[PDB]
Design a protein around this ligand. Sequence first.
Ligand SMILES: CCCCCCCCCCCCCCCCCCCCCCCCCC(=O)N[C@@H](CO[C@H]1O[C@H](CO)[C@H](O)[C@H](O)[C@H]1O)[C@H](O)[C@H](O)CCCCCCCCCCCCCC
Lengths: 272, 100
Amino acid sequence: RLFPLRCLQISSFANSSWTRTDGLAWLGELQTHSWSNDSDTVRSLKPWSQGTFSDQQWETLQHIFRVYRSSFTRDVKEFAKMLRLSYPLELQVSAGCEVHPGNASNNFFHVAFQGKDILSFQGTSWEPTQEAPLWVNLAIQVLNQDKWTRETVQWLLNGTCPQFVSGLLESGKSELKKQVKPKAWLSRGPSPGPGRLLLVCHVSGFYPKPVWVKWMRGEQEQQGTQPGDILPNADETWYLRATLDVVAGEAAGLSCRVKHSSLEGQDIVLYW
Amino acid sequence: MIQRTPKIQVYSRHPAENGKSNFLNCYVSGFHPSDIEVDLLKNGERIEKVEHSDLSFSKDWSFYLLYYTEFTPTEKDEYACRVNHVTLSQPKIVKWDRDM
Ligand SMILES: CCCCCCCCCCCCCCCCCCCCCCCCCC(=O)N[C@@H](CO[C@H]1O[C@H](CO)[C@H](O)[C@H](O)[C@H]1O)[C@H](O)[C@H](O)CCCCCCCCCCCCCC
C-alpha cells in the first residue's frame, strides 16, 4: 500500500537562452497531474486530481508554481554563470511525501544535476549529497540564505503536501483500489542457435502493477524463468513477458503460472 | 549525463489478430538526457498520428517514455520503433514480433 506522492520536474537548458521545464505528479503508480511548459497551468488528469482543495487553495498552489517555474529557471542560469558550468543543462527535481497511518508522514526533496543527485532538503535548509561535486556547497551556502524560499519549501513538505495527499487519497479511493484482470497467452520465441527454441508467456492488462509470473513447468514448481520488465499500456494497465529456454524434447508439459491480486486464489496456468 | 543509452521495447496492447484493431506500444527507457526522437514505423515509413505519455524518470534519474498508436496487424506489414538519441550513432530501430 505504497501511495506516496511523487512530484517530478524536468528542466532542460540547451544553452542559457533555450530552456524548457515540464512536470508531473504521481500518486502511487497513477499519474495524477501533468504540467507542460507550454501551458501556464498544471493539468489535472483525474477527476480527483484536486484532492480536497477548494479552487482557492489549488489556485494558490498553482500560482506558487507559475512563479516557481519562472523563478527556478531564472535562478538556474545564474548558478551556471557563477559556478562556471558548461551549458547543456539537465536539472531534475523529485519532491513529495507519503501519508502514514493517521499521524505522521515522511517527505523528500531531491534535485539532480546531469543525472546525478547534488543536493536535497534536510529539516529546514539545503544539504549537498554523498557525491555532490564540491562546487555544490558554494551554491548551497547561497540557497541556504534565502529564508523565505527556505520556509515555503518546508511548510510545503511537512504541511501542505500531507494534507493534500490525505485528501487526494480519500477522494481517490474509488480508483486506486481498482483491480483489472490480465489476459495471458503463449507462443514460441525464435531459437537463437541450439537445436531448440524458447517458450514465451505473455501477460497483459492487469492493474495493480505487482504480478507474479513463472514458467514453473511441472506442477511441482520448476525454474529457469526469465521475467522481462513490467511495461506499460496506455490504458493504465501493464504488460509482462516471461521466457524460458528449452529443449523441444521435454518442452512439453511445461506451464506458465500467473499470480495476481485481481485473481483471488486462481493462479492462471497455461500448459504448453 | 550523456551516458545512459535508451532501451527500446515494442509490444501490442492486445494479442495480434490480423484484421482486428489494436494498439502498438513502444517503451523507450533508461536514457538521459531527456532530448530524444521516437517514431513508429509501418514498413519503414513513420506513422503520422502517434501519441505518447508525459516523459518521466526513474529513481536512478533516467528518463522513460511510452509512445503508442492504434493499428491493425497484417501478415505482410511489419512495424517497428525508430529512436534517435545523443548516446547513439545511428537511430536504432527495434522491430515488433507478435511472439516476443
Ligand atoms: C512539493 C509538492 C507539494 C504538494 C502539493 C502539490 C502536489 C501536486 C503537484 C502538481 C504537479 C506539480 C509538479 C511538481 C513540480 C516539482 C516540485 C516543485 C516544488 C516547487 C516548490 C515551490 C518553491 C517556492 C519557493 C520559490 O519559488 N522561491 C524562488 C523565489 O524566491 C524569491 O522570491 C520570493 C517571493 O516569491 C521571496 O522574495 C524570496 O525571499 C526570494 O528569494 C527562488 O528564487 C528559487 O526559484 C527557488 C528554487 C527552489 C529549488 C532549488 C533546488 C536546487 C537548485 C540549485 C541547483 C543549481 C544547479 C546550477 C547548475
